[PDB]
Design a protein around this nucleic acid. Structure first.
Ligand SMILES: Nc1ncnc2c1ncn2[C@@H]1O[C@H](COP(=O)(O)OP(=O)(O)OP(O)(O)=S)[C@@H](O)[C@H]1O
Ligand SMILES: Nc1ncnc2c1ncn2[C@@H]1O[C@H](COP(=O)(O)OP(=O)(O)OP(O)(O)=S)[C@@H](O)[C@H]1O
Ligand SMILES: Nc1ncnc2c1ncn2[C@@H]1O[C@H](COP(=O)(O)OP(=O)(O)OP(O)(O)=S)[C@@H](O)[C@H]1O
Ligand SMILES: Nc1ncnc2c1ncn2[C@@H]1O[C@H](COP(=O)(O)OP(=O)(O)O)[C@@H](O)[C@H]1O
Ligand SMILES: [Mg+2]
Ligand SMILES: [Mg+2]
Ligand SMILES: [Mg+2]
Lengths: 327, 330, 354, 318, 343
DNA sequence: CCCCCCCCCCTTTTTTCGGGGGGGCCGGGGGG
DNA sequence: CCCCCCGGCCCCCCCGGC
DNA sequence: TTAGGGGGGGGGA
């Protein structure tokens, strides 16, 4: 859980897993012979599966049933299991696995696992289910393709419905707070798109990558804003124009010279930086924006360490202008 | 608040007794029988705007208690705070305490309960049950989907229908007698047609019409006055526009629509609604015509609701009608 | 030093060199600026809208408009969050970009603009007429990015306090602007400069910067590749001069932005391979582009217009591509997560092409 | 008149476990527990108006007798049930010293426990375990899934199902015999049909019909209880021709005063559970209904929008 | 330093023409008689109802309500009798429950003898909720009983551009007034008066062309007239304003460019259309104006059949609806032109 | 003993208004 | 004159369909 | 029908 994040690497992590049937069979038999009721050993596994490994729940079930039903056997195991079946909400990975299974979308599966059940499965975690579906709807071998329909067509329909669900989600979380639309979102984001590509997972279920990418985008946008407002007094443009037009040109006057003139370009680069009230951190942030063929990590690393040390020494041994005076 | 004559007609003519509520004979008779026999249950009044729910409950409270009913009934509405805390303290003490003035039972009127939070509705569940021996609850609603099933299960439901024509005519006659006004038969028909079963609309339109007459004493309200004050299309305009669209060419239809709309500054939405109403009575050979008409006109209305270009919307209406009616041949 | 795009920017209305009719109209507006209405300047990006706005302000008030300072203003939301807005101000005007605060931009309209408008001008700012100025100018950059709530909040402010503030909003497209706001502004179209004018400006820059041009055809090629974007043209001329030792030859290649190269590679990948694995791979490219401050709308526009330029596609494919582009542009305008709509558009294009 | 007749739901509320209809096995288990004692922690879940609170109160009374006043702590949604209340009042009640019969324990009743906050539920966990030797907990709820898993692990589960028409008829006939109500078979059938398995609703409708019309027949019953609108919506959605669906919409729903939002919400709910129709067709219908609902929520709640929705639904099935 | 305060008349004399010529009394409203007469009769009836003014932009709703308040209460008593809340003020449910309700419950301010002798002074106050369509549904519902319970001392005026955004109960509680669009047939007199008072010299039909271009918005027409007057004065040539200058100032595409676009569409070649549109967007023409002009050209052309017009009407409607959502103009215009070329 | 099989359990985290709950200072009052 | 008590703003986190 | 991969623990040639 996020709230347990602080405990990441400060304690010895010990895990207790669901007890197996054999380890508790003897204790259950002892309790049964002590409490003076008849239980068939063969139905023990069914009871342990009913409670999902909860020994306390198993003992409570025994105590409750033994009040009137003095015999636990195959003649009544089904009813007991159904009545005392724990209803535990699935986790994102399990929700994604079950939603993207073609069996539940067949006629028999649909009559067994109904549309209401599918919608309820979404409500187990409504904040992560659409993200998991969007992440894992392209990694399946479908088993529900209509005759004459290819996998790509179903993928396109699912993507269109996902876009519509995104529009609905934007509507829900607005000032109007139209939460009554939540069920419709469930259909538009998880159920319908899954029904188009439902099948067998073609790999491993991955966690949504949209969250980390959004965080990275936010960080880069913050850096771009800081740089734009540092260079605002010298450039006539906005942040988008700065990123798309100005930065590539600045690349040829801030990093490229060091690759040609070696350590003799420090003066010119510092002069250019001062002309735009740019700092060393601004330099580093600028050099991280370029993408594709203009990636600079290797380029900057290949620069001799002496050149970088001299650049830092020269920058730190001078008085540079200030653009924004915080007071 | 100098006098009741300074109030708007919607508030000046608010019923004070159950005999002045029209168009709800079944509900009024049943509630009167319940009150007379002392068998009033928990009540729910579900209905559309301006049907007489608040007036009916206020009249019932006044009949049960009298002139001082306001000090004997706990009335709450959306304008007031009705959170779980209020339910836990104010309503609970009101229901569990005796009346200060008389020795009778206690009434709680939760008007506009559809705006109440789910937590407060859940809290009211046991309040309604525990103090049922001496307290009664009335819940007024316009939307039943906002009421929890548990609250609905504890109340007896009464549906307020849209006002019938006869009740509106009787109330109009009473208003005319009070105001010393003359209304034409066609004017009355037009006024009832545009009301959609809402008495507040009728009263507001009549008040506007009275202000339009140069001499309200010696002048009579005609259909022309009603159409002009509301700025609504006349039936003749709708018929002419539809006929031009259905039988004339594109240029003639466009000219007719623009001319009809510019003579009195008619609104496109009103014309669309009138044409839809007219076409609803048409006997069409193919269902495709009806499907296309309904879908395209609904889309045009939705687009108009957000603004857009009026000329393009009118051309779209004309083209949609013309294309939809082309399915009646083959 | 300062880039040529910034070193040679005009600082007056008489220094303008393209769209002489627009210059004449602006001069006519500045002749009697006391009754100047609110202005909305719309046109293609990179044409000189901001330069002309600054020139108009200089003509109305004088050169002092170019003495700029930057301050920070604090705001508190309903959730107690603290937001910072960078305000660029001069002795005569104030520049703001409310979209920096996203959905909170409304507050900037509600508090800062209201405070400025509810204050009359008391400093003796003597004008050309002999009497002091009575209003302060406010420049709302990127007005097209304002949320509808902020625009609604702007409505009554411009009317009640028109005697203390005059608004100049610069936008690239008027489609996102609500009709009530457009009704309250004088709309000024700003056409992009012609190729000949761009070539003249570039030749002037070359002459001032002592650049050896093998021929004047290079300037024409640069202007044609800029598609009317003067900022891009000047920055490309500077870029092309720093890669050829300050000497431009007829064989000098035109340098494209890195994101443009990535988008062209994506277009070629989409055209060549139409498969689910190809879509999965293209998702990585889309995420990578979106994570480096490349707007989704720009990505969609460039992808659509690069796919339409492929010579191996037929008319039906291009028609389907443009229809899907329109639909998914509407979806992007009405959505939050751009990657969803972009992936849907790419999937539909792949389906149609295959 | 300033007098009120006691509702039959309270006048005839069961006071012993033997007077509760439906869920025979669960009620028998409750009687067995009341006989032997050693009542365990339990959670009773089910749909409203089926006899959960009545069963809990009857069990508590049959178990505690004259000690009910001191041995029962009852809390519901109308009372404060925050974390502070759990940590102070419930703890004090559990720690209280009370001499009870040999095989009896104190009872804490938490009616409508599904409305409690997660903090209070978490706090109750150790209180239940440390004082189980003297106190036992009985929760009553409608949605058992809202109870945290740790609490469910410590309590038995008693799920209540809908009352069959036979049980409702039995109880209604008993009340009629105890009230000398004149009735007709069709009237009782209509009462059961409109009740939909809810005993409280059935009893309230019967009392209202008796007090308003006297004779309990189909006509009088339907004058008090209106036809369920979900069934009318289902008929509208299952109509063959578009004209029939539009007629149902206009005559039975729109002209009766039903709001557009209610109509669209009911249409969505009915379509979600229309097993006769294939799942894909229901999904397309749900998409269309969601578009119509979004249009309505924006302010356009016109009859034309509902007509267009019906036309689109019919086009989907063609 | 400090500057001497200006007089109200002097300040107004240097304001934009839209604010300078705002109606001062109910008689200055041009083409809203159907509602202005009803509002004027209330100055003697003294039974003003709850009002809901709705209509397109620039029709005179705010001006009408301000004039009504000024006539009812006068310059001095107006401030204590009017509570104005607009989109620039916080209008949540809490504000409605506390601020609006508290103001409504307050006793009416005591009129002075001069006010009673010179103005009707109705015995109630007015709450004006401008741009009420921006308020949430819950806040609107919170007003339902406040409107009715305290109607004796308070009246409510809701002004909106989209009537559908007002919840049904509030619309039912309010008497509705629709403000009609101002065109060349009902607003020519006001524009002519404004031009005459400003010594603006224009050729015949210039004012009508301005009003037709405005498309129901008188504020836009007045602003365009002011711009034309400023241009003419700057030129200082003494000649009359012409319709071509007005069209150039209004952003109307020249007819020749429209004919070129039509010819390109007729050709049907995708590449040529794409190239021409790419060149066209460089001029900054607004897509909405281009679509409107294309609609005017095609729908009113006799050289096209019925099916073509039926299809083009829906195409134009779809393009306009998509543009109204704030979409890229280039893509939408190219799609529309390509679709028309294939009809 | 390493090897085999089976079973269980882990991959990982963004946000527009309104209401309700829970914790923490603060300040008014009473009292010694 | 100063300490204890205990009600009253402020603040921050968590839901939101059925 | 078991998403892939790692951790636990009873059985055993
Ligand atoms: N049945 C009726 N008979 C006579 N006048 C009526 C009737 N119903 C409504 N009216 C008129 O409409 C006014 C408002 O009636 P209300 O009962 O307050 O409206 P409503 O039914 O409560 O609508 P909602 O649900 O509150 S939006 C009354 O003061 C009457 O003038
Ligand atoms: N099984 C039943 N047998 C007899 N009467 C019943 C039965 N169930 C309900 N009733 C009657 O309906 C009334 C209300 O039932 P309750 O059990 O108190 O409500 P409920 O079942 O708790 O519904 P919720 O979930 O609390 S809203 C009782 O007082 C009885 O009169
Ligand atoms: N009916 C009219 N008569 C005279 N001038 C008018 C009229 N309508 C608009 N105007 C002019 O337009 C200006 C603005 O009018 P407003 O009433 O503020 O616009 P509006 O009707 O409120 O549009 P919205 O809904 O606020 S966008 C006025 O100051 C007048 O100069
Ligand atoms: N009249 C002109 N003469 C020379 N250069 C110009 C002129 N107008 C604009 N520019 C150049 O074009 C570049 C971009 O202009 P910009 O102000 O960004 O226009 P917009 O505001 O439309 O984006 C500026 O850096 C400026 O140097
Ligand atoms: Mg009411
Ligand atoms: Mg109970
Ligand atoms: Mg206005």
């Amino acid at each position: 859980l996020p709230k347990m994040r602080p405990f990441d690497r400060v304690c010895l992590d010990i895990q207790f897993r669901r007890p197996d049937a054999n380890s508790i069979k003897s204790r259950l038999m002892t309790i049964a012979i002590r409490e003076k009721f008849k239980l068939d050993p063969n139905v023990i596994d069914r009871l342990i599966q009913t409670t999902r490994g909860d020994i306390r729940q198993v003992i409570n079930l025994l105590s409750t049933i033994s009040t009137t039903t003095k015999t636990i056997n195959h003649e009544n195991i089904n009813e007991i299991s159904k009545a005392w079946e724990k209803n535990i909400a699935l986790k994102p990975f399990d929700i994604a696995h079950k939603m993207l299974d073609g069996q539940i979308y067949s006629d028999i599966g649909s009559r067994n696992f109904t549309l209401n059940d599918k919608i309820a499965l979404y409500f187990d975690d409504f904040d992560f289910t659409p993200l998991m579906i969007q992440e894992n709807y392209l990694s399946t071998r479908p088993s529900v393709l209509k005759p004459g329909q290819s996998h790509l067509e179903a993928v396109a329909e699912a993507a269109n419905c996902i876009s519509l669900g995104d529009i609905v989600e934007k509507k829900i979380r607005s000032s109007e707070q139209l939460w009554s639309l939540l069920p419709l979102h469930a259909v538009l984001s998880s159920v319908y798109p899954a029904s188009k590509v439902a099948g067998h997972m073609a790999g491993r279920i991955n966690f949504t990558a949209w969250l980390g990418q959004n965080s990275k985008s936010a960080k880069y946008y913050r850096l771009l804003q800081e740089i734009h407002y540092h260079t605002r007094l010298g450039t006539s443009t906005d942040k988008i124009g700065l990123r798309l037009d100005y930065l590539p040109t600045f690349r040829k006057r801030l990093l490229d010279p060091f690759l040609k003139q070696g350590a003799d370009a420090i003066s010119s680069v510092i002069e250019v930086m001062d002309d735009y009230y740019l700092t060393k951190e601004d330099w580093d942030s600028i050099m991280e924006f370029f993408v594709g063929p203009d990636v600079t990590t290797a380029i900057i690393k290949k620069i001799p360490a002496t050149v970088k040390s001299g650049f830092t020494r020269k920058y730190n041994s001078m008085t540079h202008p200030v653009a924004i005076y915080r007071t | 608040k100098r006098s009741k004559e300074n109030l708007p007609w919607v508030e000046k003519y608010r019923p004070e007794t159950l005999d002045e509520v029209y168009g709800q004979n079944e509900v009024i008779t049943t509630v009167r029988k319940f009150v007379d026999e002392g068998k009033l249950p928990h009540l729910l009044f579900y209905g559309p705007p301006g049907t007489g729910k608040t007036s009916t409950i206020v009249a019932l409270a006044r009949e049960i208690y009298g002139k001082n009913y306001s000090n004997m009934v706990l009335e709450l509405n959306a304008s007031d705070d009705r959170g779980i805390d209020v339910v836990r303290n104010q309503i609970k003490d009101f229901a569990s305490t005796r009346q200060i003035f008389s020795k009778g039972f206690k009434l709680i009127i939760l008007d506009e309960a559809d705006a109440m939070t789910n937590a407060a509705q859940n809290a009211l569940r046991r309040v309604i049950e525990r103090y049922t021996k001496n307290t009664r609850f009335c819940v007024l609603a316009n939307y039943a989907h906002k009421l929890t099933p548990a609250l609905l299960s504890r109340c007896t439901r009464f549906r307020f229908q849209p006002l019938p024509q006869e009740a509106i005519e009787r109330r109009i006659a009473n208003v005319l007698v009070h105001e010393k006004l003359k209304l034409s038969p066609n004017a009355e028909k037009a006024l009832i047609e545009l009301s959609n079963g809402d008495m507040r609309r009728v009263l507001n339109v009549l008040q506007s019409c009275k202000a339009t007459l140069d001499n309200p004493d010696e002048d009579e309200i005609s259909d022309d006055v009603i159409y002009e004050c509301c700025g609504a299309p006349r039936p003749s305009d709708l018929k002419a526009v539809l006929k031009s669209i259905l039988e004339d060419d594109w240029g003639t239809a466009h000219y007719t629509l623009n001319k009809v709309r510019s003579a009195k500054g008619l609104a496109l939405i009103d014309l669309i609604e009138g044409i839809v109403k007219i076409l609803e009575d048409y006997e069409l050979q193919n269902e495709e015509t009806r499907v296309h008409l309904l879908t395209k006109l609904a889309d045009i209305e939705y687009s108009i609701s957000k603004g857009g270009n009026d000329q393009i919307q009118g051309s779209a209406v004309i083209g949609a009608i013309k294309a939809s009616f082309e399915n009646e041949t083959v | 030093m300062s880039l040529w795009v910034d070193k040679y920017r005009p600082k007056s209305l008489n220094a303008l060199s393209h769209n002489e009719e627009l210059t004449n109209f602006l001069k006519s507006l500045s002749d009697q600026p006391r009754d100047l209405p609110h202005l909305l300047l719309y046109g293609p990006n990179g044409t000189g809208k901001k330069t002309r706005c600054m020139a108009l302000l200089e003509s109305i008030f004088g050169p002092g408009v170019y003495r700029l300072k930057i301050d920070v203003r604090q705001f508190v939301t309903a959730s107690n969050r603290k937001l910072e807005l960078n305000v660029v101000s001069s002795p005569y005007h104030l520049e703001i970009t409310p979209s920096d605060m996203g959905n909170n931009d409304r507050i900037v309209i509600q508090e800062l603009l209201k405070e400025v408008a509810q204050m009359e001008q008391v400093d003796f700012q003597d004008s050309k007429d002999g009497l002091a100025h009575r209003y302060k100018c406010v420049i709302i950059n990127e007005a097209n990015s304002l949320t509808k709530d902020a625009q609604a909040a702007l409505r009554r402010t411009m009317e009640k306090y028109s005697k203390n503030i005059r608004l100049i909003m610069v936008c690239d497209s008027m489609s996102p602007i609500i009709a009530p706001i457009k009704s309250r502004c004088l709309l000024i179209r700003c056409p992009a400069p012609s190729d000949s004018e761009i070539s003249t400006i570039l030749s002037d820059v070359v002459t001032n910067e002592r650049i050896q041009l093998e021929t004047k055809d290079i300037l024409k090629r640069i202007a044609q590749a800029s598609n009317g974007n003067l900022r891009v043209s000047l920055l490309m001329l500077e870029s092309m001069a720093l890669n050829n030792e300050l000497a431009l030859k007829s064989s000098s290649p035109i340098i494209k932005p890195d994101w443009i190269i990535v988008i062209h590679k994506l277009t070629r990948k989409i055209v060549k391979e139409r498969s689910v694995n190809s879509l999965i791979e293209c998702r990585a490219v889309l995420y990578d582009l979106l994570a480096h401050c490349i707007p989704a709308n720009i990505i969609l526009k460039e992808l659509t217009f690069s796919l339409l330029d492929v010579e191996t596609l037929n008319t039906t494919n291009k028609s389907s591509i443009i229809e899907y582009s329109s639909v998914f542009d509407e979806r992007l305008s009405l959505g939050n997560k751009a990657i969803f709509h972009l992936e849907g558009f790419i999937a539909k294009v792949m389906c149609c092409l295959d | 008149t300033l007098s009120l007749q006691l509702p039959w739901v309270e006048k005839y509320r069961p006071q012993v476990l033997s007077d509760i209809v439906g869920n025979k096995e669960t009620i028998d288990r409750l009687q067995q527990i009341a006989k032997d004692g050693n009542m365990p922690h339990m959670i009773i879940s089910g749909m409203p108006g089926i006899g959960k609170t009545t069963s809990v109160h009857c069990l508590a009374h049959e178990l505690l007798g004259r000690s009910y006043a001191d041995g029962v702590l009852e809390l519901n949604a109308s009372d404060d049930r925050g974390i502070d209340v759990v940590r102070n009042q419930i703890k004090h009640f559990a720690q209280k010293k009370l001499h009870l019969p040999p095989g009896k324990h104190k009872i804490v009743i938490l009616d409508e426990a599904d409305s409690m906050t997660a903090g209070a539920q978490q706090a109750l966990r150790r209180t239940m375990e440390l004082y189980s030797n003297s106190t036992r907990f009985a929760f009553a709820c409608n949605q058992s899934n809202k109870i945290i898993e740790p609490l469910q692990s410590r309590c038995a589960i008693l799920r209540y199902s809908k009352l069959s028409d036979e049980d409702v008829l039995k109880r209604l006939l008993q009340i009629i015999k105890l009230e000398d109500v004149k009735y007709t078979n069709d009237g009782l059938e209509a009462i059961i049909f409109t009740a939909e398995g809810d005993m409280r609703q059935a009893i309230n409708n019967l009392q209202s019909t008796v007090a308003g019309h006297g004779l309990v027949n189909a006509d009088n019953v339907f004058k008090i209880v209106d036809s369920p609108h979900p069934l009318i919506v289902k008929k509208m959605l299952l109509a063959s021709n578009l004209e029939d669906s539009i007629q149902i919409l206009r005559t039975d729903l729109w002209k009766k005063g039903y709001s557009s939002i209610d109509i669209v919400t009911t249409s969505f709910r009915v379509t979600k559970n229309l097993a006769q129709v294939k799942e894909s067709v229901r999904l397309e219908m749900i998409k269309e209904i969601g578009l119509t609902h979004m249009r309505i929520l924006e302010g356009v709640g016109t009859y034309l929008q509902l007509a267009s929705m019906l036309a689109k639904i019919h086009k989907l099935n063609n | 330093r400090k500057i001497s305060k200006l007089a109200a008349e002097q300040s107004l004399a240097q304001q934009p023409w839209v604010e300078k010529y705002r109606p001062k009394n109910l008689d200055e409203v041009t083409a809203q008689d159907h509602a202005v007469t009803v509002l004027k009769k209330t100055l003697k009836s003294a039974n003003l109802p709850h009002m809901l003014f709705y209509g397109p932009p620039g029709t005179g709703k705010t001006s009408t309500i301000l004039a009504l308040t000024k006539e009812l209460y006068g310059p001095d008593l107006m401030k204590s009798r009017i509570l104005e809340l607009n989109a620039s003020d916080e209008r949540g449910i809490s504000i409605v429950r506390e601020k609006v309700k508290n103001f409504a419950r307050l006793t009416v301010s005591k009129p002075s003898k001069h006010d009673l002798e010179n103005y009707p002074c109705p015995p109630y106050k007015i709450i004006i909720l401008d741009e009420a369509d921006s308020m949430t549904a819950d806040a609107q519902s919170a007003l339902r009983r406040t409107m009715e319970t305290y109607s004796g001392v308070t009246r409510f005026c809701l002004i909106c551009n989209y009537v559908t955004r007002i919840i049904d109960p509030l619309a039912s509680r309010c008497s509705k007034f629709r403000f009609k669009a101002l065109d060349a047939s009902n607003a020519i007199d006001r524009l002519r008066f404004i031009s005459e008072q400003e010594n603006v010299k224009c050729d015949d039909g210039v004012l009508e062309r301005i009003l037709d271009i405005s498309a129901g918005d008188l504020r836009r027409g007045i602003t365009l007239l002011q711009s034309a007057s400023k241009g003419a004065q700057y030129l200082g040539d003494g000649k009359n304003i012409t319709s071509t200058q007005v069209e150039e100032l209004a952003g109307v595409v020249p007819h020749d460019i429209l004919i070129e676009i039509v010819e390109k569409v007729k050709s049907g070649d995708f590449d040529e259309i794409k190239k021409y549109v790419n060149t066209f967007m460089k001029s900054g023409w607004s897509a909405a104006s281009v679509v409107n002009q294309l609609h005017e050209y095609y729908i009113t052309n006799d050289n096209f059949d019925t099916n073509f017009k039926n299809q083009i009407s829906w195409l134009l409607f779809t393009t306009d609806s998509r543009l109204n959502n704030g979409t890229n103009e280039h893509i939408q215009l190219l799609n529309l032109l390509v679709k028309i070329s294939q009809l």
